[PDB]
């Protein structure tokens, strides 16, 4: 809880890549995005939350399942 940011940036999403928004300090709220026509198969954002020992973002690894 100290000088903050403690989670590892996620990997760039397949045909995506993931947007800061500020800063990688615990509490902030950063974006992901995908190649236009894409939905995002998940939550579309992520929050820097400490599982113990470890802190990283609360949504899993973002797909694009890809839309006609």
């Known amino acids: 809880e100290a000088e903050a940011k403690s989670c590892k940036t ?3 999403p397949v045909n995506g890549m993931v947007h800061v928004i500020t800063d990688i300090q615990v ?3 950063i974006t992901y995005s995908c190649t236009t026509g894409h939905r995002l198969i998940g939550h579309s954002s992520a929050e820097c939350i400490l599982s113990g020992n470890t ?7 973002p797909i694009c399942q890809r839309i006609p």
């Open 10 to 12: 996620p990997p760039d």
């Open 27 to 29: 509490g902030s709220r």
């Open 55 to 61: 802190a990283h973002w609360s949504t899993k690894p």
